[PDB]
Design a protein around this ligand. Structure first.
Ligand SMILES: *[C@@H]1O[C@H](CO)[C@@H](O[C@@H]2O[C@H](CO)[C@@H](O[C@@H]3O[C@H](CO)[C@@H](O)[C@H](O[C@H]4O[C@H](CO)[C@@H](O)[C@H](O)[C@@H]4O[C@H]4O[C@H](CO)[C@@H](O)[C@H](O)[C@@H]4O[C@H]4O[C@H](CO)[C@@H](O)[C@H](O)[C@@H]4O)[C@@H]3O)[C@H](O)[C@H]2NC(C)=O)[C@H](O)[C@H]1NC(C)=O
Ligand SMILES: *[C@@H]1O[C@H](CO)[C@@H](O[C@@H]2O[C@H](CO)[C@@H](O)[C@H](O)[C@H]2NC(C)=O)[C@H](O)[C@H]1NC(C)=O
Ligand SMILES: *[B]([O])([O])C1=[C][C]=[C][C]=C1O[C]C1=[C]C(Cl)=[C][C]=[C]1
Ligand SMILES: *[C@@H]1O[C@H](CO)[C@@H](O)[C@H](O)[C@H]1NC(C)=O
Ligand SMILES: [Ca+2]
Ligand SMILES: [Zn+2]
Ligand SMILES: [Zn+2]
Length: 780
C-alpha cells in the first residue's frame, strides 16, 4: 500500500486517481500532491554538481543528487559525477563520431527518443554558436539540422506545441490560440484558468497517446513550473535507469526560456546571452548524464522550438478606436494578431462587413490589415474551426494592435514592460525557430532544407516505430533527415481515367505532352468526368462537371515572346468542337452577369504564333473572373510569367481554379458551391492557382532538366474588389506582385484544394518529390 504519501513513488510514471494523492510531476499543477511530495521528491541540498570532496561520499538521502559509489546503480548520480570523480570528459569536450547503429544496453527494445523543447528560440540565435551554446552547437553541427523550422500560425506557444505533438494545423487540432472562445461550449480557454485542463478542447492524437496505444511507454510531456530544470533532467535519467519492463521509450523536456527573456529584453538584447547559456548548461547536464549511463550513442535527441521572437514595443501599437465608432461593442484578442467578436455573443446587430470596411486602408502607413477568415492566405490554414472568429487582423511584424490607447501602459520614465513578442504571420523571418536531430536514427553532419513543424510528428513516429494517426504532414517528405526507419511512401492511385475526345451565344472575329506537360499528367484522385485537350501551346484537363479545366499546363522558354491580344479579338470566344454544348460554358451568362467577366487559363499573350493564338480563345480555356481580379491575373500572365521564364531559364506553368466555399482547405464537392455565374450552371472559383517549375540548375532549360527541380506556387483569392491591396488605384507594377507573394503556397496546398496529384513522372525519387511538394517560397 503506497497511498497517502510519496514514499517510494516520486515522479511515478502511472498517475493515480482521487481520493489518493499524487506524486507525478504534474501533481503541482492539479493541487493534488501528497503532503510530503516537496520533502521527498524535490530535494535541493548541496545543489546539482559533484565536487571533488564529495567523491565516494556516504550516501545521504537529503542530497539533491549523489556522488557515492552506488549512484550509477541507483541511477541518481549528479550529471557530472563521472567527470569530477572518475576522470572522464564532458560530452561536449569529445569530438563526434558517426553513430551508424544504436549502441544501447542489451535489453533495450528500441532507441529512446528525448524531445528537448525550447520556448521562443528564434532560428537566428543559433548564430551565436559555441561561444554561448557549446552543447547545442555540437548537436547542431554533428547531427541533422535545418537552418530554421517554420512554425504554424498564430506563432504562439499553445498552437505550436500542440502542432508539434499532433502533426495537425491548429484549425484541425482545436488549439487555435493561447486564448479562445468556443460558442458551442460557451466557454473560454486561457493560460490562467481551469478550462484548459478539460480534454474537450484538445483534438487529434498527440504523440504520447499514439505511443501508449501502440505499446511504447511514454514519460511525461508536461512539467509543473515549480520543478527546477535540473530536477527534470535528473528525473528523465532516473526513468531511463528503470528495468526493461517499466522504462519509457519517449520523453520530453520543456524550457520556458528563452521566451521569457526575449519578451523582457528583445531578441537582440545583450541580456539574451544568459538564458541561452543556461539552456545550454541544461543540455550539457542531459548529455553528460546520458554519457555516464552509456546512452549517449543510444538515444535520439530532438532540440526544437515553438516559435521565434520579434522586436516589439508599447509605442508601436495601432488602436481600433482610431478606426471604429464603437469599440465598446466588441471583444478583441489583441497583440501580434487581432481576432474580433461581439462583446455579447450572438449580438444580432454585430456586422463584420461594416467593421471590416472601417478598418480597410484608412491610413497610408497602416500596420495591420483586416480579413474575413476565409480570405486569409490559404498557406496559413487558419479558418476551419468555430473557435476562429470571422474577423481577423494580420499585424505587421514589429507592431501590436489594441482596442484603445489606454490598453497600453508605460512607466512614467517612458519604459515599456516588454521589448519582444511573437504571434505574427508564420513566414516572417523573426518567427522562425530551430530544429536539430541527433542520434543513431538521424543522419550525421547533415544540413537539410527548412521545413514546417507539421512534418515532425510523422518523423517522431518513425523514430519510435509507430504508425502515425492521420495528420497534415506529408509522410516521406522528411525521409532525408534519417539514416534508417524511413517510411517508404506510395503514389496515390489515380481514381478517374481521362477521356480523349476527338472532333464532334459567343462569336469571334500529339507532341504537346512532350513540351508542355513535363512531369506527367496530374492524377485525379476523386470520381469525376474529364477530358484531356491538346493544343500547340498548352494542354488541359477539362471537367465536364465544373465546365472548365481542373488544370492547364504550358511551357515558356527563356526566349519566348509576348504578344498582344489583337483588338479585333478582344471579345473572341470560339466553340470547342471536341466538347459538346451541354458540357461547355457560354457568353450569354457572362453578358447577363453584370458583375462577372472571364479570363483565360493559358494566356493569349504567350501564344507561339498568330495562328496558335486562336486556340487560346477556346470556350474550354475560359474561366470566370471578376473585373477586379482580371487586373491581377492579366498582370501575372502578361508581365510576370516571362520575367520568371527569363530569370529561371524558362518555366513550366500549371494553372487552374480552386473551389473552397467552406474554407476547409479541401476541394469542394458540387454541393458546397455557393455561387454560379448568373442564370447558369457555371461555378465561380474561390481562388486561382499556379505552379511554376524549372530546373534547380538554371544553366539547363526547364524542358531539358536532368536533376532536382525548383518550384514556386500561389493560390490567389478570387475577390470582386482589390480592397486587400491598399495601393490598387495605382498601376499593377506597384501592387500586384506584393499581393501574389502574400498568397504564396506549397504544391501540397494546391493538391488538397484540387484533388490532383502532381509530378508523377520524373527522374527523381518519390521522397525527393514529396520534399519539393512541401516547399514554400517565402520571399523573405
Ligand atoms: C489535416 O489533417 C486532418 C486529419 O486527417 C484532416 O481531417 C480533419 O481532421 C480533423 C481533426 O481530427 C477533423 O475534425 C474533427 O471532426 C470531428 C467530426 O466533425 C469532430 O467531432 C472532432 O471534434 C473534436 O476534436 C476537436 C478538435 O480537433 C475538439 O475541439 C472537439 O471538442 C472534439 O473533441 C474530442 O474528440 C477528440 C478526438 O476527435 C479528442 O481528442 C478530444 O479530447 C475530445 O474528446 C473528448 O471530449 C469529448 C466531449 O466531451 C468526449 O466525448 C470524449 O470521450 C473525450 O473525453 C474534430 O473537430 C475533421 O473532421 C477532419 N476532416 C476530414 C475531411 O476528415 C484535415 O482535413 C487536414 N487538412 C488539410 C487542409 O488537409
Ligand atoms: C492504504 O493506505 C491508504 C492511505 O492512508 C488508506 O486510505 C486511508 O484510509 C483511512 C481509513 O483507515 C482514511 O482515514 C484516510 O483518509 C485514507 N486515505 C486515503 C489517501 O485514501 C487505505 O485504507 C489503505 N488500504 C489498505 C487496504 O490498507
Ligand atoms: B508562448 O505563447 O510563449 C507561451 C504561452 C503561454 C504560456 C507561456 C508561454 O511561453 C513561455 C513563458 C513565457 C513567459 Cl513571458 C513566462 C514564462 C513562460
Ligand atoms: C463605420 O464608419 C461610419 C462613419 O464613416 C459610421 O457611420 C459607422 O458607425 C462605422 N461603423 C463602425 C462599426 O465602426
Ligand atoms: Ca472545401
Ligand atoms: Zn512559446
Ligand atoms: Zn511568448
Amino acid at each position: 500500500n503506497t497511498s497517502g504519501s510519496c514514499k517510494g513513488r516520486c515522479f511515478e510514471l502511472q498517475e493515480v486517481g482521487p481520493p489518493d494523492c499524487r506524486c507525478d510531476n504534474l501533481c503541482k499543477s492539479y493541487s493534488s500532491c501528497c503532503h510530503d511530495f516537496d520533502e521527498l521528491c524535490l530535494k535541493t541540498a548541496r545543489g546539482w554538481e559533484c565536487t571533488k570532496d564529495r567523491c565516494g561520499e556516504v550516501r545521504n538521502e537529503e542530497n539533491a543528487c549523489h556522488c557515492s559509489e552506488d549512484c550509477l546503480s541507483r541511477g541518481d548520480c549528479c550529471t557530472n559525477y563521472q567527470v569530477v570523480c572518475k576522470g572522464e570528459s564532458h560530452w561536449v569536450d569529445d569530438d563526434c563520431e558517426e553513430i551508424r547503429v544504436p549502441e544501447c544496453p542489451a535489453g533495450f527494445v528500441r532507441p529512446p527518443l528525448i524531445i528537448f523543447s525550447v520556448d521562443g528560440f528564434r532560428a537566428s540565435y543559433m548564430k551565436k554558436g559555441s561561444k554561448v551554446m557549446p552543447n547545442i552547437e555540437k548537436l547542431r553541427s554533428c547531427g541533422t539540422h535545418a537552418p530554421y523550422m517554420r512554425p504554424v500560425y498564430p506563432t504562439k506557444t499553445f498552437p505550436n506545441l500542440y502542432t508539434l505533438a499532433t502533426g495537425l494545423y491548429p484549425e484541425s487540432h482545436g488549439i487555435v490560440g493561447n486564448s479562445m472562445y468556443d460558442p458551442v461550449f460557451d466557454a473560454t480557454f486561457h493560460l490562467r484558468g481551469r478550462e484548459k485542463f478539460n480534454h474537450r478542447w484538445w483534438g487529434g492524437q498527440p504523440l504520447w497517446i499514439t505511443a501508449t496505444k501502440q505499446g511504447v511507454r511514454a514519460g511525461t510531456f508536461f512539467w509543473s513550473v515549480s520543478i527546477p530544470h535540473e530536477r527534470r533532467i535528473l528525473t528523465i535519467l532516473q526513468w531511463l535507469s528503470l528495468p526493461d519492463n517499466e522504462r519509457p521509450s519517449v520523453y520530453a523536456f520543456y524550457s520556458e526560456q528563452p521566451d521569457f527573456s526575449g519578451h523582457k529584453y528583445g531578441p537582440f538584447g545583450p541580456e539574451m546571452t544568459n538564458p541561452l547559456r543556461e539552456i545550454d548548461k541544461t543540455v550539457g547536464q542531459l548529455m553528460d548524464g546520458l554519457k555516464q549511463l552509456k546512452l549517449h550513442r543510444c538515444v535520439n535527441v530532438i532540440f526544437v522550438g515553438d516559435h521565434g521572437m520579434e522586436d516589439v514595443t508599447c509605442d508601436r501599437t495601432e488602436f481600433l478606436s482610431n478606426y471604429l465608432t464603437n469599440v465598446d461593442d466588441i471583444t478583441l484578442v489583441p497583440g501580434t494578431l487581432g481576432r474580433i467578436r461581439p462583446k455579447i455573443p450572438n449580438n444580432l446587430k454585430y456586422d463584420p462587413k461594416a467593421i471590416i470596411a472601417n478598418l480597410t486602408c484608412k491610413k497610408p502607413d497602416q500596420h495591420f490589415k483586416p480579413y474575413m477568415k476565409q480570405h486569409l492566405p490559404k498557406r496559413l490554414h487558419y479558418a476551419n474551426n468555430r473557435r476562429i472568429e470571422d474577423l481577423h487582423l494580420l499585424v505587421e511584424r514589429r507592431w501590436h494592435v489594441a482596442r484603445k490607447p489606454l490598453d497600453v501602459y508605460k512607466k512614467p520614465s517612458g519604459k515599456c514592460f516588454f521589448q519582444g513578442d511573437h504571434g505574427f504571420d508564420n513566414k516572417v523571418n523573426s518567427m522562425q525557430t530551430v530544429f536539430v536531430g541527433y542520434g543513431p536514427t538521424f543522419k550525421y553532419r547533415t544540413k537539410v532544407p527548412p521545413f514546417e513543424n507539421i512534418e515532425l510528428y510523422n518523423v517522431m513516429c518513425d523514430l519510435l516505430g509507430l504508425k502515425p494517426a492521420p495528420n497534415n504532414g506529408t509522410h516521406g517528405s522528411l525521409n532525408h533527415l534519417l539514416r534508417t526507419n524511413t517510411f517508404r511512401p506510395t503514389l496515390p492511385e489515380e481514381v478517374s481515367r481521362p477521356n480523349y475526345p476527338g472532333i464532334m451565344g459567343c462569336t469571334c472575329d500529339g507532341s504537346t505532352e512532350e513540351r508542355h506537360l513535363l512531369y506527367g499528367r496530374p492524377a485525379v484522385l476523386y470520381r469525376t468526368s474529364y477530358d484531356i485537350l491538346y493544343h500547340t501551346d498548352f494542354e488541359s484537363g477539362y471537367s465536364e462537371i465544373f465546365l472548365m479545366p481542373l488544370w492547364t499546363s504550358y511551357t515558356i522558354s527563356k526566349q519566348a515572346e509576348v504578344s498582344s491580344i489583337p483588338e479585333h479579338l478582344t471579345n473572341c470566344v470560339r466553340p470547342d468542337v471536341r466538347v459538346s454544348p451541354g458540357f461547355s460554358q457560354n457568353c450569354l451568362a457572362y453578358k447577363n452577369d453584370k458583375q462577372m467577366s472571364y479570363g483565360f487559363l493559358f494566356p493569349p499573350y504567350l501564344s507561339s504564333s498568330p495562328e496558335a493564338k486562336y486556340d487560346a480563345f477556346l470556350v474550354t480555356n475560359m474561366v470566370p473572373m471578376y473585373p477586379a481580379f482580371k487586373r491581377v491575373w492579366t498582370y501575372f500572365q502578361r508581365v510576370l510569367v516571362k520575367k520568371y521564364a527569363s530569370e529561371r531559364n524558362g518555366v513550366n506553368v500549371i494553372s487552374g481554379p480552386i473551389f473552397d466555399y467552406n474554407y476547409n482547405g479541401l476541394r469542394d464537392i458540387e454541393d458546397e458551391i455557393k455561387q454560379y455565374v448568373e442564370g447558369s450552371s457555371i461555378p465561380v472559383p474561390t481562388h486561382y492557382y499556379s505552379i511554376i517549375t524549372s530546373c534547380l540548375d538554371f544553366t539547363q532549360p526547364a524542358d531539358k532538366c536532368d536533376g532536382p527541380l525548383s518550384v514556386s506556387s500561389f493560390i490567389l483569392p478570387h475577390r470582386p474588389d482589390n480592397d486587400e491591396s491598399c495601393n490598387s488605384s495605382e498601376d499593377e507594377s506597384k501592387w500586384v506582385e506584393e499581393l501574389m507573394k502574400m498568397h504564396t503556397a506549397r504544391v501540397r496546398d494546391i493538391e488538397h484544394l484540387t484533388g490532383l496529384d502532381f509530378y508523377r513522372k520524373t527522374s527523381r525519387s518519390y521522397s525527393e518529390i514529396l520534399t519539393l511538394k512541401t516547399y514554400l517560397h517565402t520571399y523573405e
